[PDB]
Design a protein around this nucleic acid. Structure first.
Ligand SMILES: [Mg+2]
Ligand SMILES: [Mg+2]
Ligand SMILES: [Mg+2]
Ligand SMILES: [Mg+2]
Ligand SMILES: [Mg+2]
Ligand SMILES: [Mg+2]
Ligand SMILES: [Mg+2]
Ligand SMILES: [Mg+2]
Ligand SMILES: [Mg+2]
Ligand SMILES: [Mg+2]
Ligand SMILES: [Mg+2]
Ligand SMILES: [Mg+2]
Ligand SMILES: [Mg+2]
Ligand SMILES: [Mg+2]
Ligand SMILES: [Mg+2]
Ligand SMILES: [Mg+2]
Ligand SMILES: [Mg+2]
Ligand SMILES: [Zn+2]
Ligand SMILES: [Zn+2]
Lengths: 96, 114, 55, 68, 100
RNA sequence: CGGAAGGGCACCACCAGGAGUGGAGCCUGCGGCUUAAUUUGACCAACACGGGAAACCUCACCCGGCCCGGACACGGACAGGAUUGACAGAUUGAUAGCUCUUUCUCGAUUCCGUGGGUGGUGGUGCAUGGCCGUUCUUAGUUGGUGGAGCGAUUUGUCUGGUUAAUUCCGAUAACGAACGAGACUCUGGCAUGCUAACUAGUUACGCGACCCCGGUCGGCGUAACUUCUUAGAGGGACAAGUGGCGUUCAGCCACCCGAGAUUGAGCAAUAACAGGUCUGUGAUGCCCUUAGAUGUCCGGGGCUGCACGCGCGCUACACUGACUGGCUCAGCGUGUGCCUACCCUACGCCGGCAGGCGCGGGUAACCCGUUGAACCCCAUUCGUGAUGGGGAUCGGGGAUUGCAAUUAUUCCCCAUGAACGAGGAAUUCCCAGUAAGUGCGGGUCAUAAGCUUGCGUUGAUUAAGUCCCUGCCCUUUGUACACA
């Protein structure tokens, strides 16, 4: 994917803050639904997290028409040392 | 509701909500004895009850996976934050649930038992 | 351009505009009450929706 | 299978060596003017360069064709 | 003050349990009531060919969804009926209470 | 299995019949032919079936052109720049920078090879799951222990009577059980008794309009009530009562009482078919394809093509009728959608009509809507003539939906006026609110019912029987049959 790295780091920010992420199986979304702020297509989002899951940092589920992605511990390793983030911060699924 | 949905399509819309909720939890927690759900609604928050066998594993370490799939349910269905809550409970008399016994038979066949 | 070409055809009506709620299937939908799912998967999930065969 | 009418070849991007060099001019001391005309584009003040094409000016980002 | 309650469910016995419970709640908090009026049951009927393929004897399912709706009128203040509707409801019954 | 016997049973069988179909036009589906393609599944239990009413989409088929949506790993080349996008102008269909030429930006996301994945309405339903259909709408099926036989097996599961029924009484080397039938659920029919109702009403009462005290009003408001309306809880019918028939058992016939003295569906066993579905799926084995793609997209075409054959249907062949006025009656339902952009409409104007333009109601017992529906009833005209029957074919114009209608999408107006004179061999569905006539809703739907699923409405002839033909079940018997 010739991905705007802006948008890819933004999707990584969504995955980290809202600790896991859902999307619709729809390459022809005009624009992705979870975020209203940026401009990233659901096609970019889907293939970005397929590139995430192929080397094994996120795990996939598919119900009726929606991809579900769950960020594993190796994924939280890769995501924090990729986003250059110190280990004081944790996802909202880990906050209690 | 300001868009003011009618009652006829309202009951089939939350019926089809409970259907895809049950099928989503079936595709996820089939490894861990997911028996069913019960969805009961109040004003400003909605109690959705997963009813399964291995409650220790549907919670997970510390309760991580329940918070994980509360976030999944809210993000997928467009629920407001903290407006629905997942509670996980134990099957009374585990042997009689044909769902859980079909899944236990399925994992016996997948583990290789004759 | 290809940005103005790739999904340029209108999906405003017809068979391919609507799709199955569970399958991305275009045949045998039931739009009554906004189920928007095919008849096979409807009669699969019908007892879970609430449509019980009284007679 | 087989198809005897020949296929279209891929437009290979023309490999050029240090094409950024041709936008400014160099004197040995501080005398620098610009070979390619600048943009009144709203996104870019004076950063990116236009082109001097086969006859006549054009910018690719804002895509503005300046004609005779 | 003419505050009205509507009860709507796919189920009949749970709905009438909730409506008689609210009548007795209004009676124990001592205010009159125009009774539970029963407006007609809306049927949602679906007839589909039972077969996934095309062949077979041309048979048809007859699926139905019954929806029952009843009304309770109360001349009363607001927090009385708010605390009576905060309690004693079955999951199948949808309650909608409006003020005017 | 029998063109062998004995019993029973079913309008997917017959008799008495009714409406037909087969004959005509048209619609649709299938075969054939044709074609770039006119994709394809299925040939009682295929053929108005795939919810399959395809202009685009669907689309899978055909002609062309784009795109990667080829992850991930390894190894190259690379910021001295790996490589996206690019208006001109040519070419092209397209302003696809698709390719050529001139060159500008993007900045590590990506390209180049090898493994490997992925997508597939590609194949195989004769690798499969699920689901349906069918055997098979009949009454059938099976363990435990005991008896018989060396055994496959058998008895239980039966001589008889009886029933819709392997339903019961009863016999008894069987006893005690399970499924199926029944029971059950919904529906229908009856309550002037219960519960109550400004999202339903009735009756009064008071104002209002009109007619010569009274009458009409679906004109306006309130004091009782719930018969009508809505839907809840109970009830109500059990072969209960009576008279016969029968071992006087199971039960059958008739009659009083009665809203009913058989309402209609749903569910539906054991075993099975190499019945259908890989074209419903992110259910799926394997195979095949995988950048010149069988992936996806866009443009156009085709799915409709006509010497012909068959099937489901609608319109008809008219006087029991057509046409033109008038009068007066329903019940199902549905209605502004996550994406989703397209709802049902009163009412006021414009237009012959299709329709157009405005202000309103309705997320619905509120508004459309008291759903002023058709056949029907009444009064005209027509006159037995392919006729004022029938309305196919076809010319010209006017609207609506669409991004676009040409191979006329749909509707409107005028003109055109064909076959068809009650249909050969053959063949279907049906017995009570049934057949048939009739029109209205849902699905399909942007536009949209010659279909189908429901609904009312007018509403009978005939029958309460049989094993004759087609079949089904049980017993006996015969077999050289066992893919029977
Ligand atoms: Mg008979
Ligand atoms: Mg006959
Ligand atoms: Mg014929
Ligand atoms: Mg004919
Ligand atoms: Mg097409
Ligand atoms: Mg196409
Ligand atoms: Mg597939
Ligand atoms: Mg088969
Ligand atoms: Mg087969
Ligand atoms: Mg090959
Ligand atoms: Mg066709
Ligand atoms: Mg005529
Ligand atoms: Mg069409
Ligand atoms: Mg004539
Ligand atoms: Mg026959
Ligand atoms: Mg059809
Ligand atoms: Mg002999
Ligand atoms: Zn589906
Ligand atoms: Zn510029």
């Amino acid at each position: 994917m010739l991905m705007p790295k802006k948008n890819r780091i933004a999707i990584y920010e969504l995955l980290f803050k809202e600790g896991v992420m859902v999307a619709k199986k729809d390459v022809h979304m005009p624009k992705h639904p979870e975020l209203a702020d940026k401009n990233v297509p659901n096609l970019h989002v889907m293939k970005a997290m397929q590139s995430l899951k192929s080397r094994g940092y996120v795990k996939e589920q598919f119900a009726w028409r929606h991809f579900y992605w769950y960020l594993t511990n190796e994924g939280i390793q890769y995501l924090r040392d990729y986003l250059h983030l110190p280990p004081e911060i944790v996802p909202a699924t880990l906050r209690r | 509701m300001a868009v003011q949905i009618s009652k006829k399509r309202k009951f089939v819309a939350d019926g089809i909500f409970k259907a895809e909720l049950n099928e989503f939890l079936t595709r996820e927690l089939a490894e861990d004895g997911y028996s069913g759900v019960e969805v009961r609604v109040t004003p400003t928050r909605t109690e959705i009850i997963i009813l399964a066998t291995r409650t220790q594993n549907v919670l997970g370490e510390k309760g991580r996976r329940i918070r994980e799939l509360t976030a999944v349910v809210q993000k997928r269905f467009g629920f407001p934050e903290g407006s629905v809550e997942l509670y996980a409970e134990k099957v009374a008399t585990r042997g009689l649930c044909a769902i859980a016994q079909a899944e236990s038979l399925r994992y016996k066949l997948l583990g290789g038992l004759a | 351009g290809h940005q103005q070409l790739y999904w340029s055809h209108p999906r405003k009506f017809g068979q391919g505009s609507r799709s199955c709620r569970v399958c991305s299937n275009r045949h045998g939908l039931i739009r009554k009450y906004g189920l928007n799912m095919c008849r096979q998967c409807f009669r699969q999930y019908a007892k879970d929706i609430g449509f019980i065969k009284l007679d | 299978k087989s198809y005897t009418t020949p296929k279209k070849n891929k437009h290979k991007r023309k490999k050029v060596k240090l094409a950024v060099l041709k936008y400014y001019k160099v004197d040995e001391n501080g005398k620098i003017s610009r070979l390619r005309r600048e943009c009144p584009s709203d996104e870019c003040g004076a950063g990116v360069f236009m082109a001097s094409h086969f006859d006549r000016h054009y910018c690719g980002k804002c895509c503005l064709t300046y004609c005779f | 003050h003419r505050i009205r309650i509507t009860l709507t469910s796919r189920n009949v016995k749970s709905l009438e349990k909730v409506c008689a419970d609210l009548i007795r709640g209004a009676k124990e908090k001592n205010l009159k009531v125009k009774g539970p009026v029963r407006m007609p049951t809306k049927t949602l009927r679906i007839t589909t060919r039972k077969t996934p393929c095309g062949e077979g004897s041309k048979t048809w399912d007859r699926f139905q969804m019954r929806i029952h709706k009843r009304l309770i009128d109360l001349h009363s203040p607001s927090e009385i009926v708010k605390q009576i509707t905060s309690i004693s409801i079955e999951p199948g019954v949808e309650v909608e209470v409006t003020i005017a």
